[PDB]
Design an enzyme around this catalytic site. Sequence first.
Site, PDB file in Angstrom:
ATOM      1  N   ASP A 188      29.743  -9.248 -32.469  1.00 56.76           N
ATOM      2  CA  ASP A 188      31.273  -8.842 -32.017  1.00 56.76           C
ATOM      3  C   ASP A 188      32.342  -9.683 -32.274  1.00 56.76           C
ATOM      4  O   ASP A 188      33.386 -10.316 -31.666  1.00 56.76           O
ATOM      5  CB  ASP A 188      31.132  -8.432 -30.649  1.00 56.76           C
ATOM      6  CG  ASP A 188      31.147  -9.351 -29.474  1.00 56.76           C
ATOM      7  OD1 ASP A 188      30.459 -10.714 -30.033  1.00 56.76           O
ATOM      8  OD2 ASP A 188      31.308  -9.242 -28.326  1.00 56.76           O
ATOM      9  N   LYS A 241      34.083 -24.706 -19.491  1.00 56.58           N
ATOM     10  CA  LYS A 241      33.999 -23.713 -19.165  1.00 56.58           C
ATOM     11  C   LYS A 241      33.346 -23.663 -17.887  1.00 56.58           C
ATOM     12  O   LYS A 241      32.189 -24.235 -17.759  1.00 56.58           O
ATOM     13  CB  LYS A 241      33.187 -22.873 -20.162  1.00 56.58           C
ATOM     14  CG  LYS A 241      33.822 -21.729 -20.608  1.00 56.58           C
ATOM     15  CD  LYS A 241      33.579 -20.483 -19.787  1.00 56.58           C
ATOM     16  CE  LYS A 241      34.108 -18.969 -20.336  1.00 56.58           C
ATOM     17  NZ  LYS A 241      33.898 -18.932 -21.596  1.00 56.58           N
ATOM     18  N   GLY A 286      39.940 -15.954 -16.521  1.00 54.11           N
ATOM     19  CA  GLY A 286      39.091 -14.993 -16.745  1.00 54.11           C
ATOM     20  C   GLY A 286      38.943 -14.562 -15.018  1.00 54.11           C
ATOM     21  O   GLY A 286      38.840 -14.993 -14.230  1.00 54.11           O
ATOM     22  N   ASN A 287      38.257 -13.196 -14.926  1.00 50.77           N
ATOM     23  CA  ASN A 287      38.076 -12.539 -13.818  1.00 50.77           C
ATOM     24  C   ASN A 287      37.064 -13.207 -12.875  1.00 50.77           C
ATOM     25  O   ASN A 287      37.168 -13.876 -11.707  1.00 50.77           O
ATOM     26  CB  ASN A 287      37.288 -10.948 -13.948  1.00 50.77           C
ATOM     27  CG  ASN A 287      38.314 -10.071 -13.916  1.00 50.77           C
ATOM     28  OD1 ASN A 287      38.187  -8.871 -13.581  1.00 50.77           O
ATOM     29  ND2 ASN A 287      39.387 -10.192 -15.000  1.00 50.77           N
ATOM     30  N   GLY A 323      42.620 -21.508 -19.746  1.00 49.37           N
ATOM     31  CA  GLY A 323      42.098 -20.136 -19.556  1.00 49.37           C
ATOM     32  C   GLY A 323      41.636 -19.612 -18.367  1.00 49.37           C
ATOM     33  O   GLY A 323      41.012 -20.381 -17.443  1.00 49.37           O
ATOM     34  N   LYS A 350      36.578 -19.661 -16.119  1.00 47.17           N
ATOM     35  CA  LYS A 350      37.763 -20.561 -16.102  1.00 47.17           C
ATOM     36  C   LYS A 350      37.525 -21.453 -17.028  1.00 47.17           C
ATOM     37  O   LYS A 350      36.635 -22.271 -17.341  1.00 47.17           O
ATOM     38  CB  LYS A 350      37.823 -21.172 -14.678  1.00 47.17           C
ATOM     39  CG  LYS A 350      39.417 -21.282 -14.119  1.00 47.17           C
ATOM     40  CD  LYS A 350      39.563 -21.406 -12.584  1.00 47.17           C
ATOM     41  CE  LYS A 350      40.937 -21.424 -12.263  1.00 47.17           C
ATOM     42  NZ  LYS A 350      40.964 -21.774 -10.766  1.00 47.17           N
TER      43      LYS A 350
END
EC number: 2.7.11.1
Lengths: 302, 302
Positions: free
Chosen positions: A128, A35, A15-16, A13, A19
């Site tokens: 969400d 993570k 991400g901006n 994974g 990781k």
Amino acid sequence: PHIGNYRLLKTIGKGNFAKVKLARHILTGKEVAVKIIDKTQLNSSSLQKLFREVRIMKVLNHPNIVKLFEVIETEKTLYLVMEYASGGEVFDYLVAHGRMKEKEARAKFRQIVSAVQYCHQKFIVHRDLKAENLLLDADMNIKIALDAFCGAPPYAAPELFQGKKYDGPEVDVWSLGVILYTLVSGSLPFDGQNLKELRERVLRGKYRIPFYMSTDCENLLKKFLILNPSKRGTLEQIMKDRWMNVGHEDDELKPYVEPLPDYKDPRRTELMVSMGYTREEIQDSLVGQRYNEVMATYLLLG
Amino acid sequence: HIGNYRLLKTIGKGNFAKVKLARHILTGKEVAVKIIDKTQLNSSSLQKLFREVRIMKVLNHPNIVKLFEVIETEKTLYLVMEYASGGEVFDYLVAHGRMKEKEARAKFRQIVSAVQYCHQKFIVHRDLKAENLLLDADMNIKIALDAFCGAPPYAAPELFQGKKYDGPEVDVWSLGVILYTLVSGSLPFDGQNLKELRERVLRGKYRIPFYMSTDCENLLKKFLILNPSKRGTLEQIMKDRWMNVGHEDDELKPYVEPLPDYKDPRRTELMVSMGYTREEIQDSLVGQRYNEVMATYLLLGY
């Protein structure tokens, strides 16, 4: 080892600012997800979310929520070590294989509902729930985990579009309806080409009944997809729904009760005494719910 | 059959449509060809589609992609339009960072001219976005993972207040967000989820970058107004000081569509030479037919 007691394997994974890596816990050989968050690149509100997410994760102990094993904290970088779920998203599963038979949907939904209701009884609301949050493990059990707005509005409760509060457990209830509809239909009840279209459909609250859907199921959709937030039932009540419990006649879905703490497993304690851990640091790490290397090892040993 | 174009690369794939780059055979001009499988669309997509086609036939502005031809078959719709080879503004922004105010201004004058022009035709765009701003080879604006990526940060606040979402005043809100991105290279309202995005939009307050001029910030305040009915028209905003720096002879004004020329003798005679009749040339243009005859005539004008 690249961090604490973990050898980082591959990046699963990106991400901006964050990781996710596959990793091997060195002592136990067990696979974990790591993570790796770069806190230096996070604004005020994101740090608030991150610290909130950490508090929540530390407290959730449920067979269908990914488990947290360790939090490693440094000034610049946060590392969350957690259960890996190898089966990928339920999103991707339905894309691959189409709608679930009501039987299969039911098995996954009981897990989902149990997991969320478990949060609600701790006064945690998710707020969400989407497609990406639903993961499968190796046995196809549920594990609950370009920008944040991808595939989001179809899960939003009508209240978002009305200026109303968006914070109660009843927001999760709405999302669970959308989730249920996706499992059995393989698509979304409320969709559009844009927000305006998406909003008209949501505020209207009417969805297509697919011709193959049972009336049981459709009755159960009705209990989630209620426009008035205050007129939506608790998940504890929806748990009693007929569709929920077909083939579970001696076995009504009921609020999860977590096992009592096992912080004194003589087998695991003594194994760790070997490796050079003190009895006192073990108990302290567990009682104080420390999510340090000691506790990690103890959890991972199970 | 699109025998009059030579299909080159695919520039874009969607679920039921693809865009190809193509060469118009008679003129050699490069075009974009959107090939839409109508058999795979639901009712509302077809409405949107027929609407889009009706809008595009009527627009003739040098900062809006021109429609050159439409080819209808029972199953497939072909939209032959102008190719903008510079990609998206959103993209350019991530590559270069913010535009200097001088450059933002040249772009934004084009953008505002284009949208205001639509507004004089009572066409409102309703979801103007990053995606929708393309660049030609000379870096001129051309106005062109699901439909919800990036969309919410451009939503006007009425979307979230249950209030109607159809005025030109919606585009005005979007234009404000567009200006902010051009000059800052990020969005004025953002969040990690819908709830957070909504709170920001509804409070309407955004971070002023340190390098931004007061002229620019004043321009933003004219776009980014909570109350929809209190927002200026684009025609009023055009007089804005920031907008007109270095254009003192040249105040930005409502675009005036040029007088229709369907009798250009150079192009007419050239087309006769290609084997077209003067008869069909007349009919196609006067009739606004958007057929092969008109596509050639339009294409010979570059």
